[PDB]
Amino acid sequence: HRPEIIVVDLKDHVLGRAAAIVAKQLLLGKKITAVRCEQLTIAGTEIRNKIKYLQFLRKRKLSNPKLGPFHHRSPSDIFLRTVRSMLPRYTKRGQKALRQLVAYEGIPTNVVRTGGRVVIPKAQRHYCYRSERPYTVLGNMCKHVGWKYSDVVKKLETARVEKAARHHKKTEKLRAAWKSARKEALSKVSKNNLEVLKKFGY
Amino acid sequence: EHPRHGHLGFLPRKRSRQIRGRVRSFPKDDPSQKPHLTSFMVFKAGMTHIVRDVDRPGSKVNKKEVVEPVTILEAPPMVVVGIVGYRQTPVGHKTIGTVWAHHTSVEFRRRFYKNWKQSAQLAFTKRKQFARTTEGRLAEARTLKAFAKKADIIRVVAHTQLRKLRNNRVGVKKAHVSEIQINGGTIAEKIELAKSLLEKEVRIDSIFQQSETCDVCAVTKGHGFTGVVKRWGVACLPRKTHRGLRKVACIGAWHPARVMYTVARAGQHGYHHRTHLNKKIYQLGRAVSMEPNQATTTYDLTAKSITPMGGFVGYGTVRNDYIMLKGSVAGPRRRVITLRRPMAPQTSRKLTEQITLKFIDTSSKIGHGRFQTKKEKSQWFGPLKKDRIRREERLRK
Amino acid sequence: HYSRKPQVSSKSAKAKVSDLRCHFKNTFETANVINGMPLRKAQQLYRQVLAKTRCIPFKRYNGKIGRTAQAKEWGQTKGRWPRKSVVAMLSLLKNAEANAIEKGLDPNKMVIKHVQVDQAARMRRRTYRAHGRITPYMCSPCHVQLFMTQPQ
RNA sequence: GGUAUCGUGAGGGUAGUACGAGGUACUCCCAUGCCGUGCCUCUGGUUUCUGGAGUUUGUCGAACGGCAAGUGCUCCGACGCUAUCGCACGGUGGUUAGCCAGUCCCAAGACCAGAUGCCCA
RNA sequence: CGAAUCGCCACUUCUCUCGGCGCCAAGUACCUUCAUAUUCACAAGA
RNA sequence: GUUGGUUUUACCCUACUUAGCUGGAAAUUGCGAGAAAAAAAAAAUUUUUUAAAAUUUUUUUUUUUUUUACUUGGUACGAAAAAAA
RNA sequence: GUCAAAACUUAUGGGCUCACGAACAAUGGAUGACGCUCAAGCCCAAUUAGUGCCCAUUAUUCCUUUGGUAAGGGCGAGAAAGUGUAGCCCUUCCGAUGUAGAUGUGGCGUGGAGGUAAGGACGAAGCUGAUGGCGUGAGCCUCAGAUGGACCAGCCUCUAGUGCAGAUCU
RNA sequence: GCGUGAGCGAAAGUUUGAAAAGCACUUUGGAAAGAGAGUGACAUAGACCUGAAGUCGUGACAAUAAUGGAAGUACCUCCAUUUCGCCAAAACCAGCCUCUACUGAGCAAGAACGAGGUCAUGGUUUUGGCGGAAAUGGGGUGCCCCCACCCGUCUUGAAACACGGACCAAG
Ligand SMILES: [Mg+2]
Ligand SMILES: [Mg+2]
Ligand SMILES: [Mg+2]
Ligand SMILES: [Mg+2]
Ligand SMILES: [Mg+2]
Ligand SMILES: [Mg+2]
Ligand SMILES: [Mg+2]
Ligand SMILES: [Mg+2]
Ligand SMILES: [Mg+2]
Ligand SMILES: [Mg+2]
Ligand SMILES: [Mg+2]
Ligand SMILES: [Mg+2]
Ligand SMILES: [Mg+2]
Ligand SMILES: [Mg+2]
């Protein structure tokens, strides 16, 4: 059994727009599973954004940092904090919605090969940034800010890709069959249907 | 204004959650190296001093004998009893699994109990009967495939042999188990060292060698709810002070309107974990039965033993292999102190120095002890009344 | 009388000690331990707690009471060993096994079913404090009542 | 589900510093100061081992042995505690001295589907 | 233990810059069961 | 200008400092189901090896008990027999 | 844009902008937060595009109340010539906040009295109350006591030592 | 009772019951007391009418800054009423609301047809659902979302780091 999760693929999405759209859907009950939070982008040079983060990291309770604001450095933990800042995080409605979100760096093997991955066109980088303006890929800035697993994830991302690609041509004979099988299906007994398929573009 | 009283990176100053002094971080793996173990549990015995000829260009002591204190650390061989693999994850290392040795010394299985001898003593009983079966042999076989595949870290699970320690004061009979990382070559190389070594003893002399340094980690000696003057080193107040002298007079200000984590306060001092660095190994020492003339240096030929005349106070004879390393070691006598391979660069002119001892000391600790030898004490006093009241009895028999 | 009537009059023994002159707070603790216990294991807990072999788990009337390792038995760190209150409890449990015996009931099958130490009317006495003051001292004697059915 | 064991390490803490001499004007050395983390072999201090001795007055009839003097007092005194008054130690990598990471310290309320042992009426 | 949930799939479930099917006959031939569950009412079914 | 001239209370709350205990993943509830898991098994993606014969019996393998190498007292492999798969 | 209702980030609008930007030196930290950068910024204009939406104790409208020393009609159970009640009935209209303060009240409630009417050992007062019911409300009433044990509510008139969270009140 | 004194100066209802009939006797306890038994109409009338609050103990139960408001919902209701009517849904009518002209393609511009919505609008039933229970209402407890600065006070200004404020009863 799996619940109606939708695994948003967060690569090359604007951090705060994707965080804003996702933060809304969690309220509307969607059980999202962000992945590739390493790949979230931010406007500006990395230096703009490291300094923004290092001004964040600069904030701690002097009395006892131990209980102070916590400066998570995982791009995913950074995306969860970004997305909990956009939902009623103290009411249970929002504390609940935040637990319905599961960020991951990369795309983890439990979440791969589970179903198609969604995308947020309103949060696409090309949709948002002016293309020639500089941009900060998120897992890249946070590598410089303390995240230690930036290369662990890239080694993993390399593996799922080389693996997914091997399976994409393991199945090339198969997909090629249905393409051929389906094209010759039109030639089959579906006669009057062949005209109802021509209309509508099938 | 003066500097702060105390290091804030050693904080909270709380009781350690263990006592075995487990290594916090092993020195970084170097593939170029051949595989080796990175640490070794040892029991602090006591201290002595040694004479040595420093031969260090520069200083006023080059070519001159210097008396270094040394800690003696009895080191009965540890036994490997299982391998452990770690796989790197974006969230951090996960154990892949462990392969336990086909057999386990009871001292080890004592460790899984609070009352072994009133227990059914079933620990590793299913493993013993299952690792035997081909079903469980193939399962053990698969774990090693997972190591050779998914692992980044191979670690032996070794333990101390307290049975072999024969110390009368270290009351434990539960073995001191601990993973000991295998830095070395390729993971198959580490697995191979790991499994050939999977039920064998492991002497320190293999892990360490003389003049090389070792990081030590042991919980430091416990002092209970120590006061702020002993805990932090703050100045005690002038006699005329009312409420009491031994206090920080000002534990805060108006704002921030609360005591900060940085002001010193009474509480636990001692019995904290510590990793102290760069302790030179003045000698590995073989067990007294095997190599009786311990502490007999090239320049001090009398047959002798690393243990003082009264034995080590509170500990007694070092019946086993002993590491003898320069200076203090954290922890009370007879505490178990893990000591790893150095994590420092160790290319220092000092650290690389070969250490040829000129005189291990063996005088009594207890009193001043002006004799190096029980034979030499008798050679001073000669016969005395205990003997005449002994010698006479022998003649009558 | 009793806050709770026994389920089966013939099968239970009742016992009580009004204006018991032991501290309420200590007796409150001491009697509540017993509330579900079989009488023999409750005779026992007291004989053992009277030996400092086990403790009465103080629960509500902790206060800045000291930690003991004999309280692990009861799920908490604080525990305590009233003697004046443990003896009064044995002495009230003797009262019921006596009451239980006369009913033809068997005391060693009998189970404590209801313990209830109400706080009794208090006795005044006087302090004599610093600058000419006279604050109260007051004992807080307890009303303990209980019954103990045996299972049918 | 218990119990137990080994670990993970998000997060948080975080520290080394200065001076001098040498060597040749960087490197490289060698000491020290401060700081810090310990430790107690040595050396010093500490004695309620009132240990051993000496000793004063009272006292036990006396010697012996004590005893009282709130530890009578003086000498020596182990264990232990402790002193920069002794001693050992104080490590890197990446980015723009900083800074971050590490080493170092606490570390699952960071709820670790990490591993593992045992039993699961 | 009665539950809320109401598409699935190794044709999406790779990467980097109209996925297939399913929707009442395993199929385009309507063979063929459906009532009274009596015009909404949580789908009374998964 | 000079001189003399009672400095009280925490045992509360929080901060903090150590020190414990116990719960908890619908953060105590729902059964409201998401794993940084895997997607016949192991070894060198494909091939070969691991109960068989008519539920019970037989055979094989492993472990425990009895009669050299490990730091050297106590555990391992040796043997032989019995039990379990 | 999210928090946050609404542009599920609208425009089939214009410019400008790379680093800040969004009416009235010292505990770490504030466009409100996040975050935003072909803006989620600024100036301008817009409203589905050369063929808007969201939120008031506001407005309008509807229901109800109350007030009007406001406007009229009327006189199966009711129809009272009425300031005010459980309002004589119906209709329409306008008003409604409010400290100090003023006033009204067939307004509430208390001890007592003149009356009236009635109740009570088949249980008065008192007290208890997931006892409901009624009243805008002060409150009243009923139920139930596995409460009590002997007094007493209604109504009109009279009376007052008459209503209490707060006085460092006793 | 207080004060050397002059003087100050309480609290206290024996209101158990009709009557003492004031709990004999048994039983445990050293006792106090307890368990039975007995008296009485009642002893939760026991030396005591009533028997409040607050406080506490206990059982059971719901549960997880406080309180609080609004609205629901979950569960419970020793409550009320009603039904043997209650919940619904659709329709009809009314109401109500929404959705040419000029100009040189534009407006400063006017209706119409048609359709929709709606009872927290009025009147017309219809049709089904439910019926020891159902049903509406109330009450209780929890939750959810939302709203919500401790009151009294003097003061221009109080949530104030301004004063008074532990609880309750009688006054
Ligand atoms: Mg003073
Ligand atoms: Mg010594
Ligand atoms: Mg105390
Ligand atoms: Mg205490
Ligand atoms: Mg006096
Ligand atoms: Mg259904
Ligand atoms: Mg749970
Ligand atoms: Mg919105
Ligand atoms: Mg008004
Ligand atoms: Mg009066
Ligand atoms: Mg109530
Ligand atoms: Mg008055
Ligand atoms: Mg009474
Ligand atoms: Mg003023």
d(CA C116, CA A121): 69
DSSP character for C39? H
d(CA B329, CA C56): 44
Residues A141, A75 contacting (CB under 8 angstroms): no
Residue partners of C142: CB distance under 8 A and separation at least 6:
C20, C22, C23, C24, C27, C28, C117, C118, C119, C120
Longest Cα–Cα distance in chain C: 64
Write out chain B residues lying below 8 Å of A156, CB-based. 90
Residues C148, C111 contacting (CB under 8 angstroms): yes
CB atoms within 10 A of CB B332: 15
Radius of gyration, CA atoms only, chain A: 22
CB atoms within 10 A of CB A37: 30
d(CA B270, CA B310): 28
Q: Is C74 helix (H, G, I), strand (E, B) or coil?
A: helix
Q: Is C3 helix (H, G, I), strand (E, B) or coil?
A: coil
One-letter-per-residue 3-state SS of chain B: CCCCCCCCCCCCCCCCCCCCCCCCCCCCCCCCCCCEECEEEEEEEEEEEEEEEECCCCCCCCCEEEEEEEEEEECCCEEEEEEEEEECCCCCCEEEEEEECCCCCHHHHHHHCCCHHHCCCCCCHHHHHHCCCHHHHHHHHHHHHHHHHHCCEEEEEEECCHHHHCCCCCCCCCCCEEEEEEECCCHHHHHHHHHHCCCCEECHHHHCCCCCEEEEEEECCCCCEECHHHHCCCCCCCCCCCCCCCCCCCCCCCCCCCCCCCCCCCEECCCCEEEEEEEEEEEEECCCCCCCCCCCECCECCCCCCCCCCCECCCECCCCCEEEEECCCCCCCCCEEEEECCCCCCCCCCCCCCCCEEEECCCCCCCCCCCCCHHHHHHHHCCCHHHHHHHHHHHHC
CA dihedral B170, B175, B176, B181 (to 10 degrees): 150
The strand pair at B177-183 and A5-6 is best described as unpaired
Q: Is B89 on the interface with A (CB under 8 A)?
A: yes
d(CA A154, CA A138): 13
Strands (E), chain A: 5-6, 31-32, 41-43, 135-137
d(CA A44, CA A80): 21
Residues C39, C146 contacting (CB under 8 angstroms): no
- As to burial, measured by CB atoms within 10 angstroms (0-12 exposed, 13-18 middle, 19+ buried), residue B73 is buried
Residues B358, B297 contacting (CB under 8 angstroms): yes
In degrees, to the nearest 5, what angle opens at C-alpha B134 toward C-alphas B132 and B136?
65
Tokens of B319: 């019946």
Tokens of C148: 């103990």
Tokens of B255: 């704002």
Residues B337, B40 contacting (CB under 8 angstroms): no
Q: Is C85 helix (H, G, I), strand (E, B) or coil?
A: helix
DSSP character for A199? T
Four-residue CA torsion sign, B244, B247, B253, B259: negative
d(CA C108, CA C34): 15
Residues in chain A, overall count: 202
Q: Give chain G positions with protein CB within 7 A.
A: 1-4, 8-10, 17-19, 27-29, 33-40
Tokens of B364: 């009594």
Q: Is there a contact between A63 and B89 if contact means CB atoms under 8 Å apart?
A: no
Q: Give chain D positions with protein CB within 7 A.
A: 4-15, 21-22, 28-31, 34-43, 77-83, 86-92, 94-96, 99-108, 110, 114-119
- As to burial, measured by CB atoms within 10 angstroms (0-12 exposed, 13-18 middle, 19+ buried), residue C141 is buried
Q: Which amino acid is at A34?
A: A
C1'-nearest nucleotide to the CA of A65: D12
Tokens of C149: 């059915």
d(CA B128, CA B265): 51
- Annotation-wise, does C14 bind a ligand? no
Residue whose C-alpha is closest to residue B274's, from B53, B8, B23: B23
Q: B86, B91, B260: best mutation site toward chain A, by most A Cβ within 10 Å?
A: B91
The CA–C1' separation of A43 and G21, in angstroms, is 15
Residue A201 zone, left/alpha/beta (φ > 0; ψ -120 to 50; rest): left
Tokens of B263: 């002001």
d(CA B194, CA B367): 47
The CA C78 to ligand 4 mean position distance, Å, reads 9
Sheet holding C12-23, edge to edge: C12-23, C141-149, C114-119
d(CA A78, CA B314): 54
Q: How was this structure determined?
A: cryo-EM
Resolution at which this structure was determined, Å: 2.5
Cis before residue C107, ω within 30 degrees of 0? no
